[PDB]
């Protein structure tokens, strides 16, 4: 899972970036049943007049979250993850939920490498983990 | 729907960002049959030597548009949206259509949050609107 | 095919961008069997604290590659492309392969414009090429 977060440069502090990354990685560990070490968060900061809504320049307090996750998850965890991201990120950034927009694109696990290895089906992370080299096993377990 | 537009920084003025966003926003309202206030347009400006075509640096006058769209639309609707974006964005920017590249990615409606609420199937926008609180209804009608 | 390569600004030299770009378009030309002139490579450079892994700031030596490719390709082509991009880009950048993460998103050819014309399904590139005006043909042949 890689979350890309797009907002006007300056909207998200470095310490609020840290809080957003911690929250997304945490909600993802809990709603998806996936280990945190798989989670990547990227902040794409945007120029001043680079974001438009309804053909008109956006309010400064607008955030778009694009998430790439593995296909094969239940409908419930997907929608639950969406509602909770909209909810908790809006609170963390002190924004109205109407201005945290979240999209989930689903891609098969075999279409992803992370830590140098093709990723498995969701739910098969223990099996996948037992295939890694022992030194990779113990750096990941520290996270 | 979010159109992300990537081009070499400086190719698209702020005044042409306004024209492109309005053009994209209007085309989407007419070809897809969806309300204007659902449309987000983002401009990702690129570093000087950050764009390559066929393994070599691209000419400055090159634009790539990535659109995230809901699943469930007809083949003809998608093809008209693609062909018209290539043509009309090319004209607005005084470019050859050969250098406006457009990709359309399809995401289910329930994989999207906008205005704090999960999106419906394309074509069910009215019912969705009827679920919103009256005050949110009245700003969306403002757009 | 559009490869977007995201890394902390400064990790990839301009001269390292060219080598990565040339390598991606060459790998794509051999593993997918598609002409070089369709391949676009984009470098998205990130702020100092903009990349997080496992809820924490990433090491500098981390690269994420997002590819949009046409759907319809064999499992074998995809997995070979993924493993070879992860391995050889790691090598070109003098990075650990564990820190070149690759995602491939699949988009049907009819959902793509390049050089102003909708793309055909994979393998049908000769037919598509014979559709172009002679003058566009001889520019693509130069690439």
């Amino acid at each position: 899972p890689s979350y890309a977060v797009s907002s006007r440069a300056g909207l998200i502090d470095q310490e609020r970036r840290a809080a957003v990354a911690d929250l997304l990685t945490t909600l993802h560990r809990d709603i998806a049943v996936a280990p945190r070490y798989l989670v990547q968060v990227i902040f794409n900061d945007l120029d001043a007049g680079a974001l438009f809504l309804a053909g008109r320049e956006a309010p400064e307090g607008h955030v778009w979250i694009h998430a790439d996750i593995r296909s094969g998850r239940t409908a419930q965890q997907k929608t639950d993850l969406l509602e909770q991201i909209t909810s908790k990120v809006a609170d963390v950034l002190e924004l109205p939920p109407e201005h945290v927009w979240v999209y989930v694109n689903e891609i098969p696990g075999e279409n992803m490498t992370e830590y140098g290895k093709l990723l498995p089906e969701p739910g098969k992370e223990e099996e996948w983990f037992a295939t890694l080299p022992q030194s990779l096993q113990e750096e990941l377990s520290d996270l």
Side-chain angles (χ1 to χ4, degrees), chain A residues 50-63 98-99 101:
Chain A
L51 208 164
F52 293 74
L53 285 130
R56 292 160 99 240
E57 292 210 26
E60 204 252 344
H62 183 84
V63 172
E98 290 75 22
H99 280 311
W101 291 18

Side-chain angles (χ1 to χ4, degrees), chain A residues 21-22 28 34 41 48 71 77 85 89 112 125 128-129 132 138-140:
Chain A
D22 181 81
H28 192 92
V41 176
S71 35
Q77 52 188 4
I85 287 166
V89 168
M112 301 195 302
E125 289 87 11
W128 176 87
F129 184 83
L132 309 185
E138 298 312 298
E139 327 172 283
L140 297 193

Side-chain angles (χ1 to χ4, degrees), chain A residues 33-38 70 114-115 117-143:
Chain A
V33 186
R36 318 197 90 141
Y37 57 68
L38 288 194
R70 274 168 302 163
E114 294 186 12
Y115 302 106
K117 265 89 194 63
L118 289 161
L119 284 198
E121 171 172 326
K124 296 268 148 36
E125 289 87 11
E126 274 178 327
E127 243 183 341
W128 176 87
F129 184 83
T131 310
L132 309 185
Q134 182 157 90
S135 46
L136 186 57
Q137 281 183 332
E138 298 312 298
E139 327 172 283
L140 297 193
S141 53
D142 275 359
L143 317 173

Side-chain angles (χ1 to χ4, degrees), chain A residues 11-88:
Chain A
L11 175 70
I12 312 180
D13 260 351
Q14 184 58 44
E15 96 184 285
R16 293 228 172 173
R17 285 180 174 173
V20 165
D22 181 81
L23 164 68
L24 293 174
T25 296
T26 289
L27 288 183
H28 192 92
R29 159 188 58 97
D30 304 336
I31 300 159
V33 186
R36 318 197 90 141
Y37 57 68
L38 288 194
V39 184
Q40 169 182 265
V41 176
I42 289 156
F43 289 96
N44 294 297
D45 290 346
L46 297 173
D47 212 346
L51 208 164
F52 293 74
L53 285 130
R56 292 160 99 240
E57 292 210 26
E60 204 252 344
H62 183 84
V63 172
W64 180 54
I65 309 272
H66 181 95
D68 289 288
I69 74 165
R70 274 168 302 163
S71 35
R73 307 242 172 213
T74 73
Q76 190 167 26
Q77 52 188 4
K78 275 188 258 164
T79 54
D80 266 352
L81 186 69
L82 274 152
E83 298 187 314
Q84 289 202 15
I85 287 166
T86 310
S87 282
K88 307 299 196 46

